[model samples]
Target chain A: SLQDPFLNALRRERVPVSIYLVNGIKLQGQIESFDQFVILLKNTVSQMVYKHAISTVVPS
Target chain B: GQSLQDPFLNALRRERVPVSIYLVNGIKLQGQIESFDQFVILLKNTVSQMVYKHAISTVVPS
Candidate 1:
């Protein structure tokens, strides 16, 4: 099967993404690393974010 | 109430271990856990901040 589009973006490009979390927070950053359950994002700071916590991801 | 905090509790025990917190509302916070209680977690960063646990979905070690 093809990979998830979000995963494809991380695998193929250095695109920055705006991620919306379930509660209401939003983060914009470039993907640094990721696994099935987590993503490491590098904005001004680096962060490891859980996939489940995300509500949406938009490429920029 | 939620053992969801266990990992962070352990990380806090180590003291100054960097961690990133992902909030259910879509906020991402990075810093070291300085302290926490039943309702909130205090993080040490360029400026100290307190985040409510109810707003958090996951906390990942950096």
Candidate 2:
């Protein structure tokens, strides 16, 4: 999955994460600012963690 | 295909009432459901009775 550039970027941050860029876009093509990228990264991580935590606790 | 046309048109935004029962910690206790109108009606009636009879004693004195 390292071939997935977004996973390469986010996996270094944590596990169970595989955020991919729009298909076929190069690792750096039309790249937004790091601040914007970080915002999205935080949101994705937060949402994933939230869902995981909820599912783990509820398990319904 | 899920159609919002009937419920949305009939009752507007209030037609399709989505009831989610979650835990105190915010973990949902039940799966997201939509086809339990009868159950909701029964639960409301039971809850009203309990609120009127039992819950009033538990309310914090203010």
Show the colliding residue pairs in model 1: A21-B26, A23-B24, A23-B25, A24-B25, A25-B25, A25-B26, A25-B27
Candidate 1 local lDDT, A1-60, one digit each (tens)? 233565666646878888777767788888776665556677877665666677777777
Candidate 2 residue runs with Cα over 4 Å from true position:
A1-39, A43-60, B4-12, B15-18, B21-26, B29-62
**Which digits, one per residue and each the tens of the lDDT, describe model 2 over residues B1-62?**
32653353234224433333332333222222222221121112112100111101111101
- Ten-residue region with minimum lDDT total, candidate 2 chain B: B48-57
With a 3 Å backbone cut-off (N, CA, C), the pairs that clash in candidate 2 are none
- Native-to-model Cα distance after best TM-score fit, residue A35 in candidate 2, in Å: 15
- Give the best candidate by DockQ: 1
Categorize the docking of model 2.
Answer: incorrect
Whole-model lDDT, model 2: 0.23
Cα RMSD to the true fold for all candidates: 7.0, 18.7
User: TM-scores of the models, in the given order?
Assistant: 0.53, 0.16
